[PDB]
Design a protein around this ligand. Structure first.
Ligand SMILES: [Mn+2]
Ligand SMILES: [Mn+2]
Lengths: 295, 165, 929, 302, 295
DNA sequence: ATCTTCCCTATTTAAATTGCT
DNA sequence: AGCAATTTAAATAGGGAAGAT
């Protein structure tokens, strides 16, 4: 149905499902499933999303883009977007890359800001862990998890190279995997090819994390070819680097809870998008990328 | 019955089962198994497993047992108390070997040593291949191996976490 | 690339193929799509149009030629898209198909009459030895022969009589004898040990009368009386009417059987036997469940009683009848019209326009492609196959790696895996490292392809991956041993799959000279069997000997005589297509093949001789070949080098010879910077593969990319001491070679490993031939028999290569192409030609090539063994630890340039050398120490 | 280029610990050290062997050792001297066409962290495998160049920050990076309880022989010098999929787990030293691992 | 989808008008108001433009973006005079190759390297002219075109800024517009709002080269927010910078021929497919932009 | 809403047979 | 031999309903 997502401060990423978007009486509306029309205010939204069962028309597209309301096509849920155009400074007056994009590029270029931003993305990944506290998952304030957190903090702060950061990131990620395996009474080893519940649930949750990180990178105009940790030849490595922030804080406890209770995949999708809507995870990633790129 | 988990971690320098046995000994010596707390192990295939699971009916909290296992905290992990409608309860099975029963034949029937060897010469010598733990016994000053196997659930438990009768 | 796809399909199989074909092409309406797409788009459209299910009816046209045809859609013979096709088109005097139907039906209702003895009943129930004293096929043959001796076997009531033990069941009646041979050899063929019988027997019945019970059927023989006491519970309704209708069918058609020739009878009975094992294995594979008890034929996996013998005989009959129908009335699935073939060849491929001199409407074709290496022989073979229309062929090649090379050529030029099927039946662990994504190589085993309609008559729907790739391949790029079993096997049903493969597909055999003599005999047997069904044989060998080319033509001519008289057509002759890089010649040859072939050979020789001599060979005078190798290495480095760096190939004969030359050269004190490699075949999986890839990338001299795989800065002698593994299938280019003489085709092939990629002529001498083989010091009586055609029956009078070879000679294919039978005892070339005409002769013998009468027997598969090698046990290296008596050793570490280590893999050791330790080493594999 | 490794190339052991002699003390009576005696009890039982079924009727009087604390002392004291020696880059059997390139490729090694983890494995109780288990109080006293250091609560798995270990690590890294030696007299006092059974190191017995030999110097229970040397170099947290610190091996291999962590994945020592003498850029962690192996030493030839 | 036709090897391109695009039986098909459902080869489509009166569902965008089809709309800022925002959704769900972004932005940030790259892309105009010749129009080798190409190269060689570049564009394009017009005997003033065929066919070819240029950009991962030409009238970004390589070589001769030889919009559209696949212009632009970034 | 699957729904094609010239 | 009438039947298209996202 109609879904609101706060992204930066005031603009809202509207998600529209099972509706036909067109122009009625000179302004953009949409007929919904229940046969009731709903209009959209141009002032409070910049991102508008078209989920499953949704069609838009040409003059609705044109009038939405002329009002600064830039449209994207997404899979139902609002965090699995497959089609959009690039954010500019203004949609009609000029065509310039966003300040965030340019800042990211400059930071990526000079080697020192790239190393500092790699350290910072891991700092905010540890922050994400504490910030987004779950109920079924392990305690972030537990002594073993806090020891893993301080080990990662020491290792990131004392490192001067990227391959050290990759080893430390892998140690932290799989150490949280080991901690959640110690919670849920299983021998868990992370492999994509396994058909067990924990590994495949973590895989499709990671794909959801890639989708929401892709939406967060798109919404500030950040391109998908400037990874911090991963190599220059890794296709879409920045999506993986941004999704790393919430892979071990949100996706991992939800996936282990989902494999523990053993429910099906669509209701895990609704749990993931419910956690994304409730705690504003996309807005957290948007502010994370602003604080990374602004420096 | 609600239950709690005690999983042995980082015990590679020392075998996992030595830490498991020391967890059993420290749970015995500082109370815990009064008559109602019992143990079970999710991973007995050929080893005793690395998870101790306590399924007390009244409820085991994290604080009392983490104060109890303050000595194993370097390589232990305690999960939050979960619930289970059925736990797979184990009991103690013991072995006898020759001289054991010979001394019994000294003190029960009152026969001499040579005839006690005579009645038991071609008999005895059973060999338990069940998964086990290695226990320090404190009241009787020697260390032994205790064998555990699956049996029907009993209301009362020993001081070790196994079924009675 | 502009294509147009039309759909003939009923169902919603005109609907769920419409989604995929409308994903790639625009819709022009009326279930017709048309548009532009890439060749990889054609491959993707093929892969997701075939995999979508059964019943897809799709024809694609590229310009006006048909690209592909999914299914058995008749589509286009002249015009495309017919109107309604109903029934009753031709209905001729089919005769021989009615003959095969009658023989297969009569034999298949009698093929398992011999399981009714009490011994087979207690064998199935399991209280006796599972191996019978006499096999049940022979007991059923005894039943049928006794019934024929008693009553008139063609028109009478059946009733099984009291049968005894008979040593022979073959009489004189030609048709009865055919039925008896089909009954007895429905599991294995009879084997004749008799030397006089093997010497003399030629005809159909006159050989079949020598097939006794002692040729494999009579195992041990102590319970014969129980093996011949038989119940007669088969007399039921449907069995008796099926037997009556098939017997009367045979009765009505056997009048054309006596008008056949010997060649016909043999080929027709081979087809009948193949269809009979097809039906028997098809009914034995599936579980039918129901049974009428009191008698049983087969057992399930649990050993329970199933498939009672009446319905077993009826099921084998109908399955064999249906096998025959689908193998005799199949329009087989052919390959795509490859668009990168049909254009002109440019430059050095400009001779490949010789296909524009061949008729495109010939039913038969015998290509002898005498073109030299590096001219694109296999591409020219594919061009010749595609000149007649769509391609359906079996590229049978020696070696796994040569099949890989032809597959990679087929992949990168135009052929996808929807038409090609690379088959190597060993599952080797040679993987490509470095970069999986940036490989663009390593042709693999997937075969999206198209499953043929012949899979339903094979046992248990053919098989899994391998036999689906075998049978259903339009183009089958395979190792040759998946095709030579078509001519017949000892035990089992392994004949049927290559038989039915070669029935509807052409045969392309490349470099047949590298095979053995018995290997070439069974390959020409395969050529005869392929020509028996009108398919076309392409032989591609530059160094062909007239003898070989002749006997392959005679095998094709006998096969085309079988095919011509089988369809009741008058035999006009064989369309022989002589081909080389200088021209082509297509003649309708029914006789005088020898003068035309030798005239083409002489024309190719004159087209080779006015070109500049590329291989000047000097036979050394130095007797001792060790120091002859030393002096020749020094001389050819001082004469033939690229700025101080030279590449030498010491071709020797055997492995301990190779390690002897290596250990001498490593201990050889000289000012030359010798860097020694060992390149024989006894090596562990890892080590061997590593040598191959390195050598292929350092001896590539079409560019200067090798300067970075070796140290060319310092003047260095890069020497590779190798056995005949270098002269077969290796695209290597050495600066010079020192050859230990074993055979003249070895001389020509190792000349082909020198200046293979360059075009610069040598000035003085680029080949130094050794004075003697090293077996002269071990056996002066015979020394050239190892990797040569010298033998105990063909002995050279002198072993001196001044006596048996020219001292200075330009080595090319001319000496092998000419053909000389005189003076074979004191020249190597005439010794070679002698053996080739004295083993591959136009006789039937028993191990020969025209084999007739013996195809009925197991003799051509026992005494003519394909890949006849020594015992060969395999010592296997498992993670650095060897299995048997191996004992790893340490090499001399004097001049080794490259040494790759190995941990897994296996080495093939002859049983003779198993007695001692093979002493595996990292540098050189096996030796005697 | 292509600087091929010498076949005789070896390095000496640079962390030399003594045998860890074991004594019985009290927690507040730390000076009265009584030596822990290995007792030995006899066990009667018939022999059961695969090769001799005829000998199973009679024999095999075995007498298995054991070692407990006495029933008046509740603290086990473990004394050993760890000797760190410098010039870890000097090959003793190697030479200097490869070892000198290693010197000039591992000069940027942060010895500070290497030494920290060595002294942390010394102090936290990695050298006290089965007898730090179940101890209610752990204490380590390090005496180094007339300086006494006290450690009470150091978790052994992670190398956390404490200025006491750091203080010693300074002089240890100054030795290891430069020339000389330093000696740490390490005495561990662990309060296990009254008469708690202690764990000496084990001599290798045969498949038969006796059940278990505990390590004796002159009758008193002790632990092996190489076993303590395994403890000190247990600093390897830099292999791929690094969960716990393992002993720094040339292949990253632990015998008791049946797996090798650095073997077969291009992170073994030999590929890293060939990369160092061919001069590709190493990271800090694998270079620290290579320097830790050279401190450990061993013959690297092939 | 197996390997999926390389996007340079896709040949079908469409701009649909007055239709409802949807998915039937898994088919990308546009339905008109007369009840006619025409399918689209979505695995072979380069782009689908959407004209006025058009509409598309979610699932059609979902299986066009999975097959790599760029979908734009010809209204909004599609009046082509300002050329501000032609609403152009790209498939960024596929994680693109990154190295062309890296070499492109290394030369972007460096303004001297951007100036040199602009000169290379300005020389690509005359390269396109020479490579793609037409046999129904202006001969490239006559004296006027050779003179103006020589003047353009000698002006762009000595160029100093992007303001100097903007001017050279004025000359080339305007005078090539004019030179064709005088040879086609038509007084012609380029006007995006003009009704004559010489302008409506030119705007249709503008949208077609927009689609080809944007597909060539997205293929390499290159966005649009990194243009090489900066000016007052050059609003629109990098897609027009790539597209005006092939106005005067391809789009303008086809549009002029179409108007002169009285083609209909449908056949001009098809003439555009025939020239864009017969000379393989998409692979031309893709390989040439690889030459542009390179290092 | 969009799209899919399936059940009517009968409308719509292809085959089959057979006097008739 | 082609065809016509005329049956017979297999299949194609479409609309409505319900279940998914
Ligand atoms: Mn049989
Ligand atoms: Mn049978």
């Amino acid at each position: 149905m109609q879904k609101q997502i706060l992204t930066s401060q005031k603009r809202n990423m509207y998600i529209l499902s099972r509706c036909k978007v067109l122009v009625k009486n000179g302004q953009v509306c949409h007929l919904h499933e229940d046969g009731n029309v709903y209009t959209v205010p141009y002032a409070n939204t910049v991102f508008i999303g078209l989920a499953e069962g949704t069609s838009i028309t040409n003059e609705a597209m044109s009038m939405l883009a002329a009002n600064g309301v830039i449209v994207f096509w997404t899979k139902g849920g609002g965090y699995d977007m497959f089609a959009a155009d690039i954010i500019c400074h203004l949609p009609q007056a000029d065509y310039r890359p966003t300040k965030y994009m340019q800042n990211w590029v400059r930071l990526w270029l000079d080697e020192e800001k790239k190393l500092s931003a790699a350290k910072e993305i891991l700092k905010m990944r540890v922050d994400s862990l504490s910030t987004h506290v779950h109920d079924f998952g392990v305690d972030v304030e537990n002594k073993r998890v806090s020891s893993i957190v301080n080990k990662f903090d020491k290792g990131v702060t004392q490192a001067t190279s990227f391959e050290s950061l990759l080893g430390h990131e892998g140690t932290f990620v799989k150490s949280l995997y080991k901690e959640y395996a110690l919670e849920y009474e299983i021998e868990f080893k992370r492999d994509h090819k396994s058909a067990d519940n924990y590994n495949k649930f973590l895989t499709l949750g990671n794909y959801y994390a890639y989708g929401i990180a892709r939406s967060s990178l798109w919404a500030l105009g950040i391109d998908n070819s400037f990874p911090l940790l991963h190599g220059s030849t890794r296709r879409g490595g920045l999506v993986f680097d941004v999704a790393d922030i919430i892979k071990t804080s949100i996706i991992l406890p939800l996936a282990f809870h989902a494999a523990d209770q053993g429910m099906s995949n669509t209701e895990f999708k609704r749990s993931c998008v419910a956690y994304f809507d409730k705690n504003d995870i996309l807005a957290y990633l948007i502010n994370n990328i602003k604080r990374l790129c602004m420096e | 019955y609600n239950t709690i988990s005690i999983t042995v971690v980082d015990a590679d320098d020392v075998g996992v089962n030595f830490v498991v046995s020391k967890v059993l000994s420290t749970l015995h010596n500082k109370g815990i198994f009064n008559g109602e707390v019992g143990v079970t192990f999710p991973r007995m295939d050929k080893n005793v497993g690395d998870i101790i699971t306590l399924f007390s009916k009244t409820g085991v909290d994290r604080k009392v047992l983490t104060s109890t296992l303050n000595t194993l905290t370097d390589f232990i992990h305690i999960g939050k108390p979960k619930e289970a409608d059925k736990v797979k309860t184990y009991r103690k099975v013991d072995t006898k070997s020759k001289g054991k029963l010979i001394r019994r034949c000294i003190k029960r029937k009152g026969v001499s040593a040579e005839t006690a060897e005579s009645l038991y010469g071609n008999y005895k010598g059973e060999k338990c291949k069940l998964p086990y733990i290695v226990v320090n016994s404190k009241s009787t000053g020697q260390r032994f191996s205790m064998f555990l196997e699956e049996c029907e659930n009993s209301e009362k438990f020993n001081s070790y976490g196994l079924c009675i009768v | 690339m502009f294509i147009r796809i039309k759909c003939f399909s009923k169902q919603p199989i005109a609907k769920k193929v419409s989604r995929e074909v409308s994903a790639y092409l625009e819709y022009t309406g009326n279930n017709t799509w048309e548009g532009h797409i890439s060749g990889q788009g054609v491959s993707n459209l093929q892969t997701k149009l075939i995999n979508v299910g059964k019943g897809v009816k799709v024809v694609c046209n590229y310009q006006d030629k048909v690209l592909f045809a999914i299914g058995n859609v008749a589509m286009s013979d002249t015009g495309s898209v017919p109107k309604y096709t109903t029934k009753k088109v031709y209905k001729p005097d089919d005769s021989i198909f009615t003959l095969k139907q009658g023989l297969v039906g009569v034999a298949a209702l009698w093929h398992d009459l011999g399981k009714a003895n009490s011994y087979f009943q207690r064998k199935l129930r399991g209280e006796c030895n599972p191996s019978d004293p006499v096999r049940h096929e022979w007991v059923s043959g005894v039943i049928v022969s006794t019934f024929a001796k008693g009553n008139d076997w063609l028109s009478d009531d059946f009733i099984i009589p009291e049968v005894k033990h008979s040593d022979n069941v073959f009489g004189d009646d030609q048709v009865l004898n055919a039925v008896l041979w089909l009954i007895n050899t429905h599991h294995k063929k009879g084997l004749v040990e008799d030397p006089i019988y093997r010497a003399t027997k030629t005809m159909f019945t006159e050989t079949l009368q020598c097939v006794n019970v002692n040729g494999g059927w009579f195992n041990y023989g102590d319970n014969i009386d129980e093996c011949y006491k038989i119940d007669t519970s088969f007399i039921t309704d449907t069995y008796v009417k099926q037997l009556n209708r098939y017997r009367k069918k045979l009765l009505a058609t056997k009048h054309i059987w006596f008008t056949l020739g010997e060649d016909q009878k043999i080929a027709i009975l081979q087809e009948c036997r193949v269809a009979l094992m097809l039906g028997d294995s098809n009914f034995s594979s599936d579980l039918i469940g129901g049974d009428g008890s009191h008698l049983y034929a087969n057992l399930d996996e649990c050993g329970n009683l199933k498939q009672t013998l009446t319905q077993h005989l009826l099921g084998v009959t109908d399955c064999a009848l249906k096998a025959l129908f689908t193998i005799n009335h199949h329009k087989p699935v052919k390959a795509n019209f490859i668009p990168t073939i049909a254009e002109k060849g440019e430059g050095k491929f400009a001779w490949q326009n010789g296909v524009n001199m061949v008729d495109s409407s010939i039913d038969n074709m015998f290509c002898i492609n005498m073109a030299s290496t590096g001219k694109g022989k296999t591409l020219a073979n594919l061009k010749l196959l595609q000149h007649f229309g769509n391609v359906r062929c079996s590229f049978g090649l020696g070696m796994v790696s040569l099949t890989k090379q032809t597959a990679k050529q087929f992949l990168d030029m135009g052929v996808d895996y929807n038409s090609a099927a690379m088959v190597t039946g060993f599952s080797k662990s040679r993987f490509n490292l470095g970069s999986e994504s940036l490989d663009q190589d390593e042709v693999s085993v997937e075969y999206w392809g198209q499953t043929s309609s012949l899979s339903k008559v094979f046992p248990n729907n053919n098989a899994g991956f391998k036999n689906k790739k075998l049978l259903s391949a339009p183009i089958l790029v395979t190792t040759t041993d998946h095709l030579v079993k078509a001519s017949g096997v000892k035990k089992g049903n392994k004949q049927m799959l290559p038989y039915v493969r070669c029935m509807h597909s052409d045969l392309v055999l490349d470099e047949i000279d590298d095979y053995g003599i018995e290997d070439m005999v069974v390959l020409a047997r395969l050529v005869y069997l392929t020509a028996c069904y009108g398919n076309k044989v392409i032989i591609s060998s530059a160094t062909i000997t007239p003898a070989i080319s002749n006997i392959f033509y005679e095998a094709y001519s006998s096969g085309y005589k079988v095919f011509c008289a089988n369809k009741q057509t008058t035999y006009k002759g064989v369309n022989v297509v002589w081909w080389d890089e200088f021209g082509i010649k297509v003649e309708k040859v029914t006789d005088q093949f020898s003068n035309l072939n030798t005239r083409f050979v002489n024309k190719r020789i004159t087209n080779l001789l006015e070109s500049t001599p590329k291989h000047k060979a000097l036979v050394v005078d130095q007797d001792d070949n060790m120091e002859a190798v030393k002096q020749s290495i020094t001389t050819l480095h001082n004469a033939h080098n690229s700025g101080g760096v030279s590449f030498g190939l010491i071709r020797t004969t055997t492995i301990k010879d190779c390690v002897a030359v290596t250990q001498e050269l490593q201990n050889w004190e000289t000012d030359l910077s010798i860097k020694i490699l060992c390149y024989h075949s006894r090596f562990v999986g890892d080590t061997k593969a590593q040598m191959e890839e390195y050598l292929s990338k350092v001896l590539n001299r079409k560019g200067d990319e090798y300067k970075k795989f070796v140290d060319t800065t310092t003047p260095t002698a890069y020497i590779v001491v190798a056995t005949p593994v270098v002269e077969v299938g290796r695209d290597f280019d050495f600066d010079w070679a020192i050859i230990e003489p074993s055979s003249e085709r070895s001389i020509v092939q190792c000349a082909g490993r020198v200046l293979r990629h360059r075009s610069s002529t040598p000035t003085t001498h680029n080949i130094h031939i050794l004075k003697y083989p090293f077996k002269f010091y071990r056996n002066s009586n015979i020394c050239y028999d190892v990797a040569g055609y010298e033998s105990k029956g063909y002995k050279l009078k002198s072993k001196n290569m001044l006596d048996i070879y020219k001292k200075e000679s330009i080595v090319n294919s001319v000496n092998r192409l000419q053909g000389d039978a005189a003076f074979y005892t004191k020249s190597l070339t005439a010794l070679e030609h002698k053996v080739l005409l004295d083993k591959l002769t136009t006789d039937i013998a028993d191990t020969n090539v025209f084999v007739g009468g013996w195809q009925l027997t197991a003799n051509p598969h026992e005494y003519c063994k394909w890949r006849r090698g020594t015992k060969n046990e395999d010592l296997v290296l498992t993670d650095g630890k060897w299995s048997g008596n191996v004992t790893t050793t340490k090499p001399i570490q004097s001049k080794i340039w490259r040494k790759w280590q190995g941990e897994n893999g296996s080495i093939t050791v002859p049983e003779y050398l198993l007695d001692k330790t093979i002493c595996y080493n990292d540098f050189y594999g096996g030796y005697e120490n | 280029t292509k600087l091929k490794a010498p076949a005789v190339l070896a390095y000496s052991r640079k962390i030399n610990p003594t045998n860890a002699l074991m004594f019985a003390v009290n927690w507040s009576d730390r000076d009265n050290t009584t030596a822990v005696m290995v007792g030995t009890k006899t066990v009667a039982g018939t022999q059961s062997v695969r090769g001799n079924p005829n000998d199973a009727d009679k024999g095999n009087i075995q007498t298995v050792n054991f070692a407990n604390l006495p029933h008046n002392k509740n603290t086990l004291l473990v004394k050993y001297n760890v000797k760190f020696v410098g010039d870890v880059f000097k090959a003793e059997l190697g030479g200097g066409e490869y070892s000198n390139t290693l010197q000039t490729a591992l000069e940027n090694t942060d010895f500070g962290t290497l030494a920290y983890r060595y002294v942390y494995n010394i102090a936290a109780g990695r050298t006290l495998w089965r007898n730090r288990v179940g101890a209610e109080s752990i204490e380590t006293v390090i005496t180094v160049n007339d300086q006494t250091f006290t450690f009470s609560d150091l978790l052994v798995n992670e190398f956390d920050e404490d200025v006491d270990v750091a203080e010693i690590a300074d002089m240890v890294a100054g030795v290891l990076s430069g020339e000389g030696f330093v000696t740490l007299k390490v005495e561990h006092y662990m309060l296990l309880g009254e008469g708690s059974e202690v764990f000496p190191s084990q001599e290798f017995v045969e498949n038969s022989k006796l059940s278990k030999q505990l390590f004796d110097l002159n009758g008193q229970a002790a632990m092996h010098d190489q076993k303590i040397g395994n403890a000190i170099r247990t600093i390897d947290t830099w292999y791929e999929d690094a969960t716990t610190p393992i002993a720094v091996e040339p292949y990253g291999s632990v015998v008791r787990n049946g797996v090798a962590y650095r073997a077969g994945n291009k992170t073994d020592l030999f590929t890293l030293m060939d990369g160092a003498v061919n001069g590709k850029s190493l990271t800090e962690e694998d270079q620290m691992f290579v320097t830790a192996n050279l401190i450990r030493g061993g013959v690297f030839g092939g």
